[PDB]
Design a protein around this motif. Structure first.
Motif, PDB file in Angstrom:
ATOM      1  N   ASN A   1      -8.167   1.496 -13.560  1.00 48.87           N
ATOM      2  CA  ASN A   1      -9.258   2.174 -14.258  1.00 48.87           C
ATOM      3  C   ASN A   1      -8.801   3.308 -15.163  1.00 48.87           C
ATOM      4  O   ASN A   1      -9.460   3.576 -16.172  1.00 48.87           O
ATOM      5  CB  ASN A   1     -10.278   2.730 -13.266  1.00 48.87           C
ATOM      6  N   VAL A   2      -7.707   3.975 -14.780  1.00 50.45           N
ATOM      7  CA  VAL A   2      -7.122   5.092 -15.543  1.00 50.45           C
ATOM      8  C   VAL A   2      -6.575   4.640 -16.900  1.00 50.45           C
ATOM      9  O   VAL A   2      -6.936   5.223 -17.933  1.00 50.45           O
ATOM     10  CB  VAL A   2      -6.058   5.858 -14.702  1.00 50.45           C
ATOM     11  N   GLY A   3      -5.763   3.581 -16.883  1.00 50.91           N
ATOM     12  CA  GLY A   3      -5.099   3.074 -18.078  1.00 50.91           C
ATOM     13  C   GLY A   3      -6.035   2.435 -19.082  1.00 50.91           C
ATOM     14  O   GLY A   3      -5.799   2.530 -20.287  1.00 50.91           O
ATOM     15  N   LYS A   4      -7.098   1.811 -18.571  1.00 55.68           N
ATOM     16  CA  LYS A   4      -8.207   1.321 -19.397  1.00 55.68           C
ATOM     17  C   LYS A   4      -9.004   2.449 -20.039  1.00 55.68           C
ATOM     18  O   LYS A   4      -9.443   2.310 -21.178  1.00 55.68           O
ATOM     19  CB  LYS A   4      -9.129   0.404 -18.588  1.00 55.68           C
ATOM     20  N   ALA A   5      -9.171   3.555 -19.315  1.00 53.53           N
ATOM     21  CA  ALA A   5      -9.842   4.742 -19.855  1.00 53.53           C
ATOM     22  C   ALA A   5      -8.989   5.488 -20.885  1.00 53.53           C
ATOM     23  O   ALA A   5      -9.528   6.009 -21.864  1.00 53.53           O
ATOM     24  CB  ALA A   5     -10.266   5.681 -18.736  1.00 53.53           C
ATOM     25  N   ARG A   6      -7.672   5.527 -20.665  1.00 51.65           N
ATOM     26  CA  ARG A   6      -6.730   6.168 -21.605  1.00 51.65           C
ATOM     27  C   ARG A   6      -6.258   5.272 -22.765  1.00 51.65           C
ATOM     28  O   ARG A   6      -5.672   5.767 -23.731  1.00 51.65           O
ATOM     29  CB  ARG A   6      -5.509   6.749 -20.864  1.00 51.65           C
ATOM     30  N   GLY A   7      -6.522   3.970 -22.679  1.00 49.90           N
ATOM     31  CA  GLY A   7      -6.035   3.013 -23.674  1.00 49.90           C
ATOM     32  C   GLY A   7      -4.550   2.717 -23.543  1.00 49.90           C
ATOM     33  O   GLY A   7      -3.844   2.610 -24.547  1.00 49.90           O
ATOM     34  N   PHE A   8      -4.082   2.597 -22.302  1.00 49.37           N
ATOM     35  CA  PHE A   8      -2.698   2.213 -21.997  1.00 49.37           C
ATOM     36  C   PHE A   8      -2.637   0.689 -22.000  1.00 49.37           C
ATOM     37  O   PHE A   8      -1.649   0.103 -22.443  1.00 49.37           O
ATOM     38  CB  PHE A   8      -2.272   2.686 -20.598  1.00 49.37           C
ATOM     39  N   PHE A   9      -3.689   0.068 -21.464  1.00 44.15           N
ATOM     40  CA  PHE A   9      -3.836  -1.385 -21.403  1.00 44.15           C
ATOM     41  C   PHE A   9      -5.314  -1.781 -21.367  1.00 44.15           C
ATOM     42  O   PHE A   9      -6.146  -1.014 -20.884  1.00 44.15           O
ATOM     43  CB  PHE A   9      -3.086  -1.992 -20.193  1.00 44.15           C
ATOM     44  N   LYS A  10      -5.618  -2.984 -21.856  1.00 45.77           N
ATOM     45  CA  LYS A  10      -6.955  -3.576 -21.749  1.00 45.77           C
ATOM     46  C   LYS A  10      -6.958  -4.645 -20.643  1.00 45.77           C
ATOM     47  O   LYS A  10      -5.958  -4.791 -19.935  1.00 45.77           O
ATOM     48  CB  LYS A  10      -7.404  -4.122 -23.118  1.00 45.77           C
ATOM     49  N   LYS A  11      -8.086  -5.346 -20.485  1.00 46.29           N
ATOM     50  CA  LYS A  11      -8.235  -6.495 -19.569  1.00 46.29           C
ATOM     51  C   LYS A  11      -7.334  -7.653 -19.999  1.00 46.29           C
ATOM     52  O   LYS A  11      -7.276  -7.985 -21.182  1.00 46.29           O
ATOM     53  CB  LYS A  11      -9.698  -6.962 -19.560  1.00 46.29           C
ATOM     54  N   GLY A  12      -6.608  -8.237 -19.046  1.00 43.22           N
ATOM     55  CA  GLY A  12      -5.723  -9.366 -19.340  1.00 43.22           C
ATOM     56  C   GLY A  12      -4.321  -9.010 -19.821  1.00 43.22           C
ATOM     57  O   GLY A  12      -3.526  -9.904 -20.128  1.00 43.22           O
ATOM     58  N   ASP A  13      -4.009  -7.711 -19.881  1.00 44.09           N
ATOM     59  CA  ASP A  13      -2.631  -7.248 -20.074  1.00 44.09           C
ATOM     60  C   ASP A  13      -1.869  -7.357 -18.750  1.00 44.09           C
ATOM     61  O   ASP A  13      -2.467  -7.552 -17.684  1.00 44.09           O
ATOM     62  CB  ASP A  13      -2.590  -5.803 -20.603  1.00 44.09           C
ATOM     63  N   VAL A  14      -0.548  -7.224 -18.819  1.00 42.26           N
ATOM     64  CA  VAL A  14       0.297  -7.356 -17.636  1.00 42.26           C
ATOM     65  C   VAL A  14       0.811  -5.980 -17.217  1.00 42.26           C
ATOM     66  O   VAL A  14       1.206  -5.178 -18.070  1.00 42.26           O
ATOM     67  CB  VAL A  14       1.490  -8.307 -17.866  1.00 42.26           C
ATOM     68  N   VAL A  15       0.756  -5.692 -15.912  1.00 39.17           N
ATOM     69  CA  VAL A  15       1.313  -4.447 -15.338  1.00 39.17           C
ATOM     70  C   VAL A  15       2.165  -4.743 -14.103  1.00 39.17           C
ATOM     71  O   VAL A  15       2.015  -5.798 -13.475  1.00 39.17           O
ATOM     72  CB  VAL A  15       0.239  -3.378 -14.964  1.00 39.17           C
ATOM     73  N   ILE A  16       3.046  -3.798 -13.765  1.00 38.21           N
ATOM     74  CA  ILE A  16       3.913  -3.885 -12.584  1.00 38.21           C
ATOM     75  C   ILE A  16       3.313  -2.982 -11.501  1.00 38.21           C
ATOM     76  O   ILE A  16       3.016  -1.821 -11.770  1.00 38.21           O
ATOM     77  CB  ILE A  16       5.368  -3.440 -12.904  1.00 38.21           C
ATOM     78  N   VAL A  17       3.090  -3.514 -10.297  1.00 36.31           N
ATOM     79  CA  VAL A  17       2.526  -2.723  -9.190  1.00 36.31           C
ATOM     80  C   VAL A  17       3.532  -2.584  -8.038  1.00 36.31           C
ATOM     81  O   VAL A  17       3.946  -3.577  -7.426  1.00 36.31           O
ATOM     82  CB  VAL A  17       1.144  -3.253  -8.714  1.00 36.31           C
ATOM     83  N   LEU A  18       3.916  -1.337  -7.767  1.00 35.34           N
ATOM     84  CA  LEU A  18       4.847  -1.006  -6.702  1.00 35.34           C
ATOM     85  C   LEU A  18       4.138  -0.517  -5.466  1.00 35.34           C
ATOM     86  O   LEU A  18       3.325   0.402  -5.529  1.00 35.34           O
ATOM     87  CB  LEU A  18       5.821   0.064  -7.160  1.00 35.34           C
ATOM     88  N   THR A  19       4.472  -1.138  -4.340  1.00 36.16           N
ATOM     89  CA  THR A  19       3.877  -0.831  -3.051  1.00 36.16           C
ATOM     90  C   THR A  19       4.933  -1.001  -1.972  1.00 36.16           C
ATOM     91  O   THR A  19       6.069  -1.383  -2.259  1.00 36.16           O
ATOM     92  CB  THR A  19       2.691  -1.772  -2.743  1.00 36.16           C
ATOM     93  N   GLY A  20       4.552  -0.705  -0.733  1.00 33.55           N
ATOM     94  CA  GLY A  20       5.401  -0.968   0.412  1.00 33.55           C
ATOM     95  C   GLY A  20       4.714  -1.750   1.499  1.00 33.55           C
ATOM     96  O   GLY A  20       3.553  -2.142   1.354  1.00 33.55           O
ATOM     97  N   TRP A  21       5.450  -1.967   2.586  1.00 33.93           N
ATOM     98  CA  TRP A  21       5.034  -2.867   3.667  1.00 33.93           C
ATOM     99  C   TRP A  21       4.287  -2.196   4.832  1.00 33.93           C
ATOM    100  O   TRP A  21       3.677  -2.898   5.643  1.00 33.93           O
ATOM    101  CB  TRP A  21       6.236  -3.683   4.190  1.00 33.93           C
ATOM    102  N   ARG A  22       4.328  -0.860   4.908  1.00 32.68           N
ATOM    103  CA  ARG A  22       3.689  -0.087   5.996  1.00 32.68           C
ATOM    104  C   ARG A  22       3.325   1.331   5.473  1.00 32.68           C
ATOM    105  O   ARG A  22       3.817   1.709   4.400  1.00 32.68           O
ATOM    106  CB  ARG A  22       4.609  -0.082   7.242  1.00 32.68           C
ATOM    107  N   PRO A  23       2.447   2.105   6.181  1.00 36.88           N
ATOM    108  CA  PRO A  23       2.158   3.439   5.614  1.00 36.88           C
ATOM    109  C   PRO A  23       3.221   4.482   5.946  1.00 36.88           C
ATOM    110  O   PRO A  23       4.001   4.285   6.878  1.00 36.88           O
ATOM    111  CB  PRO A  23       0.830   3.822   6.271  1.00 36.88           C
ATOM    112  N   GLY A  24       3.223   5.580   5.194  1.00 37.13           N
ATOM    113  CA  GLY A  24       4.224   6.640   5.328  1.00 37.13           C
ATOM    114  C   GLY A  24       5.296   6.467   4.277  1.00 37.13           C
ATOM    115  O   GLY A  24       5.405   5.395   3.690  1.00 37.13           O
ATOM    116  N   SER A  25       6.087   7.514   4.047  1.00 40.98           N
ATOM    117  CA  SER A  25       7.102   7.522   2.983  1.00 40.98           C
ATOM    118  C   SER A  25       8.346   6.689   3.301  1.00 40.98           C
ATOM    119  O   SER A  25       8.688   6.493   4.469  1.00 40.98           O
ATOM    120  CB  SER A  25       7.525   8.957   2.649  1.00 40.98           C
ATOM    121  N   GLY A  26       8.997   6.194   2.245  1.00 39.97           N
ATOM    122  CA  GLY A  26      10.300   5.530   2.349  1.00 39.97           C
ATOM    123  C   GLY A  26      10.319   4.023   2.554  1.00 39.97           C
ATOM    124  O   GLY A  26      11.402   3.438   2.726  1.00 39.97           O
TER     125      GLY A  26
END
Lengths: 518, 518, 511, 501
Positions: A482-507
């Protein structure tokens, strides 16, 4: 086409330069941080709202002047203007607060019983430097008080003394008890409370002085995000600032200002101790010769890029915009080249503190950086940053480099990162992607401190923690979307990279995902 | 220390050569596919089990010889031997079945009514070539029947005629209506049913003959995985093979055998039309000059590596191992350099079809390739492979290249990929990672055809589909953890890259995960 | 285009591979030297004349077999056949003579079957020496029990028979048979990974090396070199009388591969002696040792010879195999300064076809070198010295690449200035002009060098004698087809007579 | 360790940057040209001697203001101060004289609030301007910038004879102010009426180079050569790229010209000021690729008009220009009307010399050699072999005998570390050689020896005498020496690696 993408396809560095097109527009995102000194010309809530809109990321306070009430009311006014955009969290930009210490400064007294009076030192004439406190506010054409009381011990009988940012130059002829009879090499206008430099001298002034102890305590109480520690000469100076701040100031980031020859010489121990570096070019250009400052700059920036820690370029970057609505061609080139070299942040001093056009200088540094970020030869830079430590057993670094490789291949709108401490988004920043990093966090100290790294757009997620962890992960991902669509970083149907992890907490950041924008 | 990893850190190709080390042992994983021609020396189920254990991946069937009854039993024997290992799915290897076509061939007749019998051809003696069918089983040192009736129409006087793998060469002195009178340039022992070559002179035999029409229909009926299409001159020759296979055999991978001057000359249109290439070096060594075969070999391999399609290096690779238990130094250098050049597979012809030591020939190709794979300069190769198409809007390519980069950074045990059609596992293989690609599939055709690509160690999941897709993903991932533990690819605690996607079915691969081996 | 010039313009190594074109014919020049083992198939003067015509550069003599009087007559016939081409010095090719020594050997004492998985004692006692059998075997190497531990491997008869040591005594070992075979008498033994304390030269080897100095041989191929002191031992044997004879160390085992750098800095060159190496180390690992040794010699600028079984099927057949064809190509592509033929030219039925086939394969491979990356990596790896000759050599190779020159003409006395041009690997052939005949023979060791022998009188002025020797090389390259009139060439000369003063690089059209 | 040589050994651009050392002192050779604009602060013979001693190479004359007799006396004083050092030809520094033209210009008439409306008219009896074809060149939405871009105006409606426009930026409007048109294809003549008489004056005054103002296309450069003629055929034409159209049609301008000036002051009015570095690095790199001169200009040490030290931005700009690969660096008001003229010349000398040592030569020469086209010219092959040889032995100099400049220009193209000592008997060549990075020109005043080999060796020995006395090398050191096979231009073919005696 856009983003200097034709220049990005070049086989050689010279051809990258050759294919730099002025008719190629950049993307909307500006990756480099803008630090602004807040002073008389910009400390109102009204002006500070327009500074954030123009693109201010960090508010610096110079503790060389001003009382604790002046800085507290400035801090209060920064936060009044920052939290005025907080009602819609999709458009709320986090703004860091930075303390810059006075440090071991030698400084002059008051000319003619005034702060604004000016005597005219004409060339070749004599001047009596004194330490006598009767002459403290009675500084004339003939007399000069200064505050370093051990100044007669540590100078030689043919030393050079520089006053008012190197502009007035002196030479010691006779050495007295409390006095120092000089001879003026370069004259000019001597005003009140001007900084004195002794480039040949082993100055035995404290690492963390009496005033600095009081200032750092105030930084902890007012909850600053970073300390810009003045005149760092060695690693034990950085450790003393770390120990003075202590337990309560453990999350406050120490940025060592390299201002002198000993800081340049002992840089590696300082960098390993510090959280980041400021190339403090003003004091450095008086201490070392002015022709050698770019060597010092590109060393410091390049080694920080190598070590993966923050670096700030500073001093006189748009200096004429104190008085003028637009900078000189040197000033435009300097901001461009510092962003090109790899400075994570760029800084404004008197331009935003006391300038007549402080909004224009923030806007100018936004426009130059964004053009220079497109002008980076990413092909070479990413291939050279990959070769530094190309085997590591840490799983989180592998995901960070794999995300950056993926972001170049699809030429992505963003790299969305969930992070608690900053560390996962800090790892992406070190490989210098073209794509803007969107760091999602619920920690607001992480949101303010993430401005120290190139690439990172920090977003503060004010939403409550959802009962399932997997659904709470997707809520934070949709927030950045929602942020990047509001700032004009990307529109609908553009490609982005999403970084996440496997459990909560740091590292535990180990999951890279290539998603379309819904 | 191990894996030629000291050689992998070289900044130059020359120092990469310099740091190659006989004491630096490779990993257990061998990436290059070993294709074996099955004949009398390796046709039994008992022998075929030992071929699989020695590391056969593809079974080639030469359709120049043998009827449809014979080849079906060879196909049955390969499948009986492969499905003996199916009882334990961890140690089960999929074996492909390949159909090498006859093509436009020219053969001689029988020597004195006998396949076994031989005559000696003296240098500078005559030899009357005939087309009269009374001399069909009546060849000797004076009379030679052959099966190409338009030989006199396409050959003028003085042009060369090569017989029996180019060992005997003849030169035409005069041509009649249905005869040629030759002079023997190179002498030797002439036997029955030997291949005839006419370089320079264009042969007007069809691309797909009426025998070749029936053999490809037999391929569709017997469920073969690939076709090695003989003597491909142009793209319409590939289109004719594709038409004969039709809609029923649309998933059978065509591999064009480039075998003459015209197929080299029109290579790019052939590669566009085919799913792969064989560098069929045997007849190419006769058609073009023998000194020019390496130029043609390194062209085809490099362009297939560029296009992303498979390439097979063939003929005489360990030719002395038909008779001897260990190869010559040239043969060991040939197998090494082919894998170094980037050949996805390597092939054994008479070594496994007819030789005294077929198991030793499969083992030696397994030993040499695995050493050669460690000797690859992955630092340069991947950097040049990245730069071929550095922008694409396809997100599955971005995931694949990001996983290969991540695998280089952590020096991973494997790249585990879930795939249905092969495509996501294929996409990883084209970038040439050091890490072995463990492709998990429930599709057995996909499991057999994956041996065509370098790096892909295909495993066939025999478990039924768990209704929880998250559990059905992780059961297959842990099955691939159990293959590499049992195969000695990695142990518990090692780092692997895991590639899956966001929904079931084909084409939705987007998730890269850096996980420890449990 | 000609000479793979479309592929030379590629920006990547992969694209260089992609643009290799079979209808792109090379220049006439073949840079890689061809070494040929002479035996019964190639010993006569009429055969050796056709060997020179087909493109032999070095005549190798295997001193493992044959007497001194046999080998002297071989040398005589080589020189008879070589000096038949001396009457026109424009077309005269110099031919080097090489002495390959036997080396130190471990031997055994009617044959017997060795069963796979059985057991065999190996005594050192000379009571059981004259006839050995399936239980007891004798060896001549006394210090085996020092250099071999428990669990060490012992190969007999070119690695056909293999034995694992189970228990170690003082004067005996007791083995377990692994890869069994038929054991005969007087057969060659190898100990993989063992630091063998045998002498650098045998008693036969001292006699044979002394003989080479008397026979005026140009180079020595010293067998079984393990360390630098072994090279210094061969140097000691040759002495001051044969101080200019080049010592090429044959690396034959594990220890020579391990201690390669000290050997290379001691030796004048290296042979990758692949047959003995393939017995000694695992056969899968021989190419790793090949590209190590070739690359390090290319780094150091010393010669390297690829050897053994390169066109092995041309003993019996008129064409080689595809494995044999790619091996000769990949050796020249790796950076082997020379390539060898053993049984192909010594005893084989097709020696003239094999010499010609190595010439045809090398010339195609020299064009197929990616010179753009290769020169860039040699430029970078070169240390910044104060030697004038080195700076001139690298400037000359650079100038040959810029104008795509027909040749690099180098006047040299010792060889050294032409050798310095060779190590930067130019595309253009190096035409080395010399009045020294030993230099002309020894120059075939290096890649690029086409040695020419000036037999003209020494002119009155030094500068006009210099220009005549340049003009002679212009006349050679026009006659041999390397350039025509008006083509651009690079010319290396010096500023004063005598060695070590090459400073001048000139870019001239051919008259 | 000196000359940033530890940084020269780095395998990557990043590590080269990491190893840049403030404690590594440079060599005494400074290779970039310094072009100084002469005005009332630096016009006397006394001051101009000290300008040369500080390090002036080219004297720029701005012909925008000043009469012919003023500029002739300015030309005379440059030569009076230059020839005062001519007694010792070992230490004689040649000084070039440049003629910067005024150019075509759009002005206002004789005698402004923010967001207002004024009308632009072209009836010769509200604001009037003197470019009558202005209605054709601009459109609805186009911008018009008055008085060095201080007042900005966007056109709302365009007529045949008139324009009605909305004001964007404020400020007071005065009389005869210069008007810019951003993005426009302006049909003002390439040479104006006043510039014709300025260019014929430069031929009469014997100038070395012309800085031709407002160059938009290839035919414009040819009009400058047409006016210069056969009497001004050896005078080099350096095009000033001042707008969008000069940036767009750059490759045809560079083909026609003898050099380019990145005229950043006029460019930043015309294009957006944030885009000027992109245009700078394009123009520097392409001129480096083509082997032709490039001069970086405007506001390089701007605060040294008033202050004795520059700003840090000003110090970084001069360094980064020399780093990018600019053959010359310019001073405008800094030397013309500034309070500290000699200090600015010294500061440009000091910064450039540090920057020349900081050039990553290893990549630069590798790339310049890669993009070099294979041709059959002996001079080109000798030049690149000489630079290769100078890198390998780490030589003190590349000595080049040259008549016209051309052989020394071909060496300078490939960017060596070592100073290129050009020996010449031609006095104009010695002045014009300052346009190229690396070239340290020396005028051989000795007469022609009868034996030509003696005349060759005399000039080579003269270069050994200059470099010993200037601290480029000493006796026993190694240098590269370039000569050719006969007299006359175009025959340099002979590279030699000589000990310094």
């Amino acid at each position: 086409q856009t983003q200097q993408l034709h220049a990005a396809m070049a086989d050689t560095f010279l051809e990258h330069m050759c294919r730099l097109d002025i008719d190629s527009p950049p993307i909307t995102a500006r990756n480099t941080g803008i630090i602004c000194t807040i002073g008389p010309a910009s400390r109102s809530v009204e002006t500070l709202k327009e500074m954030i809109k123009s693109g201010m990321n960090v508010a610096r306070l110079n503790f060389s002047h001003g009382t604790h009430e002046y800085h507290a009311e400035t801090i209060k006014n920064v936060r009044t203007a920052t939290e005025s955009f907080a009602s819609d969290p999709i458009l709320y930009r986090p703004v860091a607060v930075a303390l810059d210490t006075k440090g071991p400064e030698i400084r002059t007294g008051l000319i003619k019983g005034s702060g604004t009076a000016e005597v005219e030192l004409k060339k070749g004439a004599t001047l009596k430097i004194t330490l006598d406190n009767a002459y403290m506010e009675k500084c004339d054409e003939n007399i000069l008080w200064l505050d370093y009381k051990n100044i007669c011990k540590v100078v030689e009988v043919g030393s050079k003394i520089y006053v008012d940012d190197g502009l007035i130059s002196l030479q010691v002829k006779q050495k007295g008890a409390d006095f120092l009879v000089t001879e003026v090499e370069n004259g000019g206008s001597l005003g009140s409370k001007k900084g004195v430099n002794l480039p040949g001298a082993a100055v035995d002034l404290p690492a963390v002085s009496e005033k600095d102890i009081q200032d750092l305590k105030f930084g902890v109480e007012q909850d600053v995000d970073m300390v810009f520690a003045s005149f760092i000469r060695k690693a034990s100076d950085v450790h003393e600032v770390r120990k003075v701040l202590g337990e309560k100031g453990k999350n406050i980031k120490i940025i060592s200002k390299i201002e002198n020859h000993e800081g340049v010489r002992r840089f590696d121990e300082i960098l390993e101790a510090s959280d980041g570096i400021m190339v403090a070019r003003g004091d450095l250009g008086i201490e070392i010769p002015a022709e050698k400052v770019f060597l010092a700059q590109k060393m410091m920036i390049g080694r920080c890029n190598r070590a993966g820690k923050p670096v700030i370029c500073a001093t006189q970057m748009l200096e004429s915009m104190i008085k003028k609505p637009r900078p000189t061609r040197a000033e435009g080139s300097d901001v461009a080249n510092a962003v090109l070299d790899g400075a994570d942040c760029i800084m404004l001093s008197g331009e935003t503190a006391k300038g007549d056009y402080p909004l224009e200088a923030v806007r100018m540094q936004h426009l130059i950086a964004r053009e220079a970020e497109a002008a980076i030869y990413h092909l070479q830079l990413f291939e050279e940053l990959r070769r530094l430590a190309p085997i590591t057993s840490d799983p989180t670094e592998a995901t960070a480099v794999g995300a950056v490789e993926a972001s170049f291949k699809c030429c992505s709108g963003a790299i969305i990162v969930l992070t608690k401490s900053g560390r996962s988004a800090h790892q992406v920043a070190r490989y210098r992607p073209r794509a803007p990093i969107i760091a999602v966090t619920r920690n607001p100290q992480t949101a303010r401190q993430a401005h120290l790294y190139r690439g990172i757009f920090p977003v503060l997620c004010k939403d409550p923690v959802q009962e399932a962890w997997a659904e709470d992960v997707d809520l934070r991902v949709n927030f950045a979307m929602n942020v990047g669509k509001a700032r004009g970083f990307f529109k609908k149907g553009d490609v982005v990279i999403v970084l996440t992890g496997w459990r909560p907490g740091s590292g535990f950041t180990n999951t890279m995902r290539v998603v379309p924008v819904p």
